Amino acid sequence: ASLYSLMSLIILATLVGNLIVIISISHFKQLHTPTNWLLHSMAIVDFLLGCLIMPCSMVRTVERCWYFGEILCKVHTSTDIMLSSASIFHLAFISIDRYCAVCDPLRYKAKINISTILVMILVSWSLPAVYAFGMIFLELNLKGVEELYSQVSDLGGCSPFFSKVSGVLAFMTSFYIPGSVMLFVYYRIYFIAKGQARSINRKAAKTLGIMVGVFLVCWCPFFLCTVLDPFYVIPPSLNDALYWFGYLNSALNPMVYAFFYPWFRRALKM
Ligand SMILES: [NH3+]C1CCCCC1
């Protein structure tokens, strides 16, 4: 229906959007710097996520029940968590790269060599993976809220249904730490980038605004709901609209960090 065709659009958009990043960057021997390796890796992560999770998840929400079979479920949701705890981390390390240009600008190249960038890619793909799988594979969403998951007998649907202290921990680490680093950085860049045009006069707001705005509107609603419910009036059907918000964010990530800019456009429009 409306939902079906519409959600397929998003998945395809993600796939075609990111293969572009990866084709342009790997073989051009004009783009061999430390920064691009991040937009490459984010492309990769969003790609994998898109293709495997999205279509499985897309089957699930045009229905009330998961019927794939339960041995599969746990694998699946952990993959969803891992791949996105990856996307948010990627945005934060890009922030540090950008902070480091517009502050210590005499030392930048030395500090951001390809070795640093390598650590930044391994950490991004390691800690999300591990944590998601370890948590959901040792019966650790529910420890104390076991019966409910009533919520999985009749409902039998893969919902990350979190326990009381589960919501606080998961929400905190992935939204609160990655969210805060970003805000500090962009705040300072507003004051410096706008302060300079004082001197040269005798743009910043649009760019920085559009980056932070996207992230927040796409994630704040799903995550706020999540920490709250262990304190359970929320409904099942409405709760779903929030997952898909995260997935939509993933597409627009390529447009915001690798196409708004002229170098990409010119090289791609060769
Ligand atoms: N959709 C999921 C992504 C992060 C973990 C909990 C929600």
Curated annotation (Swiss-Prot):
2-phenylethylamine binds at D80. One of its GO terms (molecular function) is G protein-coupled amine receptor activity. Changing Y247A: Abolished activation of G(s) G alpha proteins in response to beta-phenylethylamine-binding. Does not affect activation of G(q) G alpha proteins in response to cyclohexylamine-binding. One of its GO terms (biological process) is adenylate cyclase-activating dopamine receptor signaling pathway. It holds the Pfam family 7tm_1. The chain crosses the membrane at residues 2-26, 37-58, 74-96, 117-138, 165-187, 205-228, 240-260. Changing P160A: Reduced activation of G(s) G alpha proteins in response to beta-phenylethylamine-binding. Does not affect activation of G(q) G alpha proteins in response to cyclohexylamine-binding. Intracellular G-protein coupled receptor for trace amines, which recognizes endogenous amine-containing metabolites such as beta-phenylethylamine (beta-PEA), 3-iodothyronamine (T1AM), isoamylamine (IAA), cadaverine (CAD), cyclohexylamine (CHA), p-tyramine (p-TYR), trimethylamine (TMA), octopamine and tryptamine. Also functions as a receptor for various drugs and psychoactive substances, such as amphetamine and methamphetamine. Unresponsive to classical biogenic amines, such as epinephrine and histamine and only partially activated by dopamine and serotonin. CDD domains: 7tmA_TAAR1 (cd15314). PROSITE patterns: G_PROTEIN_RECEP_F1_1, G_PROTEIN_RECEP_F1_2. Changing D80A: Abolished activation of G(s) G alpha proteins in response to agonist-binding. Residues 151-162 are annotated as: Extracellular Loop 2 (ECL2). It comes from Mus musculus. Gene3D superfamilies: Rhodopsin 7-helix transmembrane proteins. It is a multi-pass membrane protein. The keyword Membrane applies. This is Trace amine-associated receptor 1. Disulfide bonds join C73-C158. Coiled coil: none annotated. The keyword Membrane applies.
